[PDB]
Amino acid sequence: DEEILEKLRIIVSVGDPKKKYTRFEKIGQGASGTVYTAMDVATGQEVAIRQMNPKKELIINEILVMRENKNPNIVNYLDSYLVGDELWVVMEYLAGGSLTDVVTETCMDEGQIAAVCRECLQALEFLHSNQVIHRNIKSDNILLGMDGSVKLTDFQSKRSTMVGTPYWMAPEVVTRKAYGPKVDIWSLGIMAIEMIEGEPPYLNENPLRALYLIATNGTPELQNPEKLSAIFRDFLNRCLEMDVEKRGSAKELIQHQFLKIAKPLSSLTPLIAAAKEAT
């Protein structure tokens, strides 16, 4: 408990978070811990707060790592507090909802998809340079701002029965091989397909059949290949190479020509407006 506490108390701030924040509202769904949205009473900034507390954790190290390493395209650590038999971690939050609501209720054009893909690749290049693998690049984990900001958020037994379909997972992942950061590039490709088709792949499959198809055939079958520009199709091909060596890195894909048709992020705000109206 010594090492554990002391490191906290270096970084954790003094004060009562109960007075610094108002308008708490549950949204998680912790584990691990419970996650609320709330508002800074001094600045009006809206934040997300996770309250938790404990077998052990890297918690302190991640916390330390994320306080030292921030990036505009991820939701960043803001502050932390030890509150009684609890720990509170305060992180950034955005009010424009998830990419999956946009994907579900609108039809994105290639310029908008390129804008999103570019923001995500900026997050991924950053994370990968810090030896972090997200592992869950999917529309549910992309948060949008009212100004069109884009941030990544939220970053097994063989005997267990599979419940959800792990549609975003790379072949090397589903076949339980050793794997690296490029699994995130695969999931990005899947997410780009989701944006253009308006729903994730494998929707009509059992988890096991989907698992088999991913391992065996790799990329899902494009429902309507004719509809995509050559340059978008090239970008997808680069993301969804089954051979990890041939698959692009985040750094390389940042240079891809598809990203150069990206609209300004302001082009996403009409999509957020549609999605909120729809929901």
Ligand X SMILES: Nc1ncnc2c1ncn2[C@@H]1O[C@H](COP(=O)(O)OP(=O)(O)NP(=O)(O)O)[C@@H](O)[C@H]1O
Site residues, Mg ion (CB under 5 A): 140-141, 154
| Nearest-approach distance from CB 141 to Mg ion, in angstroms | 5
Check binding of 273 to its own copies (CB under 8 A). Answer: no
- Residue among 128 and 138 whose Cβ is closer to Mg ion: 138
Check binding of 27 to ligand X (CB under 6 A). Answer: yes
Interaction pattern, residues 30-69, with ligand X; x per rule: CB under 6 A:
xxx--x------------x---------------------
- Residue among 30 and 180 whose Cβ is closer to ligand X: 30
Check binding of 103 to ligand X (CB under 6 A). Answer: no
Bridge partners of residue 47, in order along the sequence: 38, 92
| Nearest-approach distance from CB 103 to Mg ion, in angstroms | 14
Site residues (CB under 6 A) for ligand X, limited to 133-152: 140, 143
Looking from the CA of 64 toward its CB, the CA atoms found within 13 Å total 11
Q: Would you list the DSSP string of 87-107?
A: EEEEEE--SS-BHHHHHHHS-
Site residues (CB under 8 A) for its own copies, limited to 10-29: 26, 29
Q: How far apart are CA 32 and CA 256, in angstroms?
A: 37
Q: How far apart are CA 103 and CA 197, in angstroms?
A: 8
- Residue among 75 and 236 whose Cβ is closer to Mg ion: 75
Nearest CA to 180 among 250, 230, 110, 116?
A: 250
Check binding of 55 to its own copies (CB under 8 A). Answer: no
Tell me the torsion sign for CA atoms 85, 90, 91, 97. Answer: positive
Interaction pattern, residues 119-158, with its own copies; x per rule: CB under 8 A:
-----------------x-x-x-------------x---x
Q: How far apart are CA 152 and CA 197, in angstroms?
A: 21
Q: How far apart are CA 78 and CA 186, in angstroms?
A: 30
| Nearest-approach distance from CB 233 to ligand X, in angstroms | 30
Residue 218: other Cβ atoms inside 10 A: 14
Q: How far apart are CA 100 and CA 193, in angstroms?
A: 12
- Residue among 23 and 176 whose Cβ is closer to ligand X: 176
- Interface residues with ligand X (CB under 6 A) are 27-28, 30-32, 35, 48, 75, 91, 93-94, 98, 140, 143, 160-161
